[PDB]
């Protein structure tokens, strides 16, 4: 109803940013109103907007874990392997916040790179082990990556698992025993 009575300046409405730096793609993809995201992308809003934290709609929807919102973004030529101020990809946030279907959707459905480093040089297996999500790390090891890839502090993954003392995640990296990292 608002999008009827403007000929082209709809885009001038859709390309503006909030005080945070948000476009309504960032808010709608931040909430997960899926049909609204289908409405905004049919109304051709630019997916390459960025907030003050350097984040795109894949980082917000991947942060809250919505499948068809990210699917709707990637149909609208969104860019996976974009990075934030911390250099976090969408796989980093989905691995941080426990969405295994979104991880399978990115890596399997859209060929996202597994071993993406942050600004702190962190793969999402131990950025996933930072929040300590066991089945997510089961999925990342089921897809396979460089386990003992050191971080900015030279951190093999069980070090980051031990800083936030998640015992079952260390039971995953050690009970499976793929790298002999005791």
């Amino acid at each position: 109803m608002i999008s009827h009575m403007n000929p082209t300046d709809i885009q001038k409405a859709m390309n503006r940013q909030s005080s945070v730096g948000w476009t309504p793609l960032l808010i709608a993809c931040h909430r997960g109103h899926m049909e609204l995201v289908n409405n905004l992308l049919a109304n051709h809003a630019r997916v390459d907007v960025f907030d003050t934290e350097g984040r795109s709609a894949l980082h917000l929807a991947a942060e809250r874990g919505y499948l068809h919102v990210c699917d709707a973004l990637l149909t609208n030529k969104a860019f996976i392997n974009s990075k934030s101020r911390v250099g976090r990809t969408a796989l980093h946030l989905a691995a941080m916040n426990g969405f295994t279907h979104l991880v399978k959707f990115l890596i399997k459905d859209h060929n996202a790179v597994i071993d993406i480093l942050t600004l702190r040089k962190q793969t999402p297996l131990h950025l996933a082990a930072a929040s300590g999500q066991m089945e997510v790390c089961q999925l990342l090891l089921e897809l396979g990556a460089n386990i003992d890839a050191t971080d900015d502090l030279g951190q093999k993954p069980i070090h980051v698992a031990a800083q936030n003392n998640y015992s079952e995640v260390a039971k995953l990296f050690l009970q499976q025993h793929p790298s002999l990292v005791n």
Binding site: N15, R46, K83, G87
Partner: protein, 274 residues
Amino acid sequence: DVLKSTNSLRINSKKLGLTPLHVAAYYGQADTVRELLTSVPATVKSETPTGQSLFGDLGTESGMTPLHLAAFSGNENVVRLLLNSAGVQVDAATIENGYNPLHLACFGGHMSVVGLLLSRSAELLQSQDRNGRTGLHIAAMHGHIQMVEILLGQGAEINATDRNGWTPLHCAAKAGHLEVVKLLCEAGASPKSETNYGCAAIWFAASEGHNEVLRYLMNKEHDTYGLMEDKRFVYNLMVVSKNHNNKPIQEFVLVSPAPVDTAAKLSNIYIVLS
């Protein structure tokens, strides 16, 4: 838009060999850049400038894509757009001068663009130019300190030669940026490191002024008996000692492993060169 009705929007050769997308990518504003991405094929690697170029230290660059200039003036949002465009070409990025946009970020501070590019590519820390220089050489010889700190932070080989054998500590010593030399010495490069004419760091630190770089490098390890046979080094050490109250010649005597041999033999080299 009104000129987009008529013009081809990638023209300029007279007095500047470039495109309007270079100028739009250079001075900032980003949605204008987006519209020019929809109108111009977005990676053109423009031309040689005629008469009088922009860019300061780049008096002439042949084939700069507009990713380079957005990497150059700082333009970080435009960097984020051009890293997500159709023709990105962050890796090859070749110029007749030889540079890559990480180096063009090194010509200024512009550490945000360095974070964007090293976060994006990361096969660019070890990217050498046509003259063999890396980014640590250019960040050294332009004296951007925290740029060198970040460039060691991502991790680069410090003892890395050019095609003539220049370590970046040679370029930092020749440019005489003292704190860059303190950073490279304090966490890295060996001062006993030659060149492809036979040199060291103190030969460049003596060849062009710079008493304090000369006393810092002279406090480090070096081969004096290889230095006193270089008569140009002896002459330039005389020249610097003339200006700086002949403390550095005293320092070159008192550092050497046999100070009496160095004072006596080097005094004879003075009298023979007289």
